[PDB]
Symmetry: C3
Subunit: 262 residues, 3 copies
């Protein structure tokens, strides 16, 4: 049962961190892992593979960490690494971290991602708040009769707090695709038609599960490249990592500054 | 084999109803179940869970009924409850009722659904004939080399009969999504671009399977809400049920009136 | 492991053909199988079902052949028949032939398909070069962290060579859908919005796997019908086969002429 696995994981988290409730959770994936060093100093570091329900039996050798980090007056669970849908496992693994974090007390989920920029104004290394999303995966993490409204899924209140940290922050619509291939130029022209400003390979199911669980969500993209066809140059995964490493200090300091306002 | 399970189910239906052929079938899901009481008086009521192939081993406790109802001069199989794709089981469960109904003699399938209204003209409680659909599930119920043309999938002849019952009936294009989450406002703007007038979580596979089996299809949506982003208010599943209960008499009397014209 | 199965298949191919490296591969599916007789004279003909990894245990009775054909100065592996995604098996079966062909030495993949024409200029029996694609399947054949850029997926260099064979060849964007049902007219209007010129049921995963493996790709569609809603007439699978048989000589001679330029 997903709820039961989430409660079991939250109990292990409380026991191993010695902290009974974490009120905020942050998910870092590719593009954002370097930012951990500027975000804060963990008081507990746990391998995801040691926690119930996090890592598929299939491969345990590539999973990241769960961190307990004090940020302002909060106790923050930081997921340092995602198991992406493109690994080919059930979505329960994608959204179990959100569900476990909620069961541990998290009222707010900060979901970070890397993205390709579709919109005219965007630059490599630019953070962009997610105002809404397009789920283009043809999937949902909700199974059976679990209904959730996604109006204001990306909390307006939390985007306002982020704009206090940086009043020039852009905001835009994120298209979540399966991956792991990059899009063709024709696909990017299609996404422009569909109203996407950003394109990536994560996040949409985490947002849905978070809202279904009653948590508020803040989404932040790092633009790692302009999308296929815009510059004419080929894309490469090296760009994602390079942008993450280059932006690390700024991005960690931004997240810490915003979370302290919660 | 799906054909074999459909023939076995049709034989149980004939045996238990005492009726050798049902010439019409109706599928009622959320939004439409209250209409049964105005549609007619069943002569046989069977739990779906007692019929071969209807209900996944996984959960038998939420499935509805199969009714045998005389409507005009017809003998009508009424599926009172669907197993939706969002329950997470193979599509064979979604379309097995259509295939079983065909094997029982059904020449016409009336597929009802609840929908969110995308178009400017629509109101809560309004019935809308389905003129065409957009299958946005990335799935098909047809497996292997079973080809079907979907031109005039929603029989023009049957829509004309429905307009005899009510000459002011609107018609529009239904977008079938996986569900079970509601759409974001950005998703609804996308669906408007794609040409959808109605959005829901059923029907498209039933229509495909019906056409592949050689049955004519009439589709009828009940608008239960305007789609996300139109009013600015959040959506809720309570709206679907409330609209169904409020419209019950009108909707049952409409279906009976149209089916009598077949 | 897909790589291991591809290497095992390539070793069987080398052993049974007596040819240590095939430098070009061609995939023929519905619409194109008749063209084999004009393409060349195979030196070895193997059932796909005898080769590691080609055919699912589920059904071995419908799979085609693998041919070794000398075309110009090349040694060409010709896949005479595809196992389509709509058969319902893992994508590894879809893309295993490309991966096996690469492991056998193939530097260039020629991927043929049948398609419905969405664009104003197109005629039944017309070959059209694929300039780009839209993958509308919500799937990828790449599993885990295998990243590939799809800029110039359909090699500009190879399309130029094809235009030497026939300077009037049209080019357009191919939309790959799951199938096996045809599209509704509303779906076709949607695909026009999304920028598709051609619509079919194959190819996109083969292209992705080919690019990930480091092969160049040439894509060629045969227009077998105008898409749903354009003429108003219903579509039928008979049209695909009839167009394939009628175009056989021209299409085989075209492929041979282009491959000799590689
Ligand atoms: C190319 O390989 C990857 C692998 C993983 C991710 C997401 C990781 P996350 O931080 O969400 O956990 C991305 S995201 C990404 C940046 N630019 C593009 C692009 O142009 N198209 C589509 N997607 C992306 C790209
Ligand atoms: C919100 O929960 C549900 C659950 C089930 C159904 C379908 C049942 P059926 O009668 O087809 O068997 C719907 S349908 C529906 C009404 N308004 C919307 C909307 O705005 N978006 C998308 N879909 C719907 C909604
Ligand atoms: C109708 O049945 C089939 C079965 C198989 C294929 C593809 C075989 P391939 O050569 O790629 O291996 C097609 S392709 C096709 C032609 N016209 C249409 C159309 O109008 N819509 C969508 N698709 C097609 C159609
Ligand atoms: Cl990650
Ligand atoms: Cl990273
Ligand atoms: Cl760039
Ligand atoms: Cl129902
Ligand atoms: Cl109801
Ligand atoms: Cl409303
Ligand atoms: Cl084939
Ligand atoms: Cl053929
Ligand atoms: Cl035609
Ligand atoms: Na995740
Ligand atoms: Na059903
Ligand atoms: Na294939």
């Amino acid at each position: 049962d997903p709820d039961e696995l989430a409660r079991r994981a939250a109990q292990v988290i409380a026991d191993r961190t010695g902290i009974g409730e974490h009120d905020v959770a942050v998910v870092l994936g590719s593009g954002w892992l370097p930012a951990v060093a500027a975000l804060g100093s963990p008081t507990t570091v746990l391998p995801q593979a040691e926690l119930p329900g996090f890592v598929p039996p299939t491969a345990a050798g590539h999973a990241g960490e769960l961190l307990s980090v004090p940020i302002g007056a909060h106790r923050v669970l930081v997921l340092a690494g995602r198991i992406h849908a493109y690994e080919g496992h059930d979505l329960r693994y994608v959204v179990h971290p959100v569900r476990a974090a909620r069961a541990a007390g998290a009222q707010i989920m900060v979901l970070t991602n890397a993205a390709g920029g579709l919109r005219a104004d965007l630059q490599v290394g630019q953070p962009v708040l997610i105002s809404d999303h397009l789920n283009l995966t043809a999937r949902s993490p909700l199974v059976g009769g679990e209904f959730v409204d996604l109006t204001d899924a990306y909390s307006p209140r939390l985007r306002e707090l982020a704009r206090q940290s940086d009043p020039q922050l852009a905001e835009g619509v994120y298209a979540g695709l399966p991956g792991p291939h990059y899009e063709t130029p024709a696909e990017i022209r299609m996404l422009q038609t569909l109203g996407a400003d950003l394109v990536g390979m994560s996040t949409v199911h985490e947002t849905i599960a978070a809202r279904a669980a009653g948590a508020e969500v803040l989404g932040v993209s790092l633009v790692t490249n302009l999308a296929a066809g815009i510059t004419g140059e080929p894309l490469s995964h090296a760009e994602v990592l390079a942008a993450g490493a280059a932006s690390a200090t700024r991005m960690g300091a931004l997240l810490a500054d915003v979370i302290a306002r919660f």
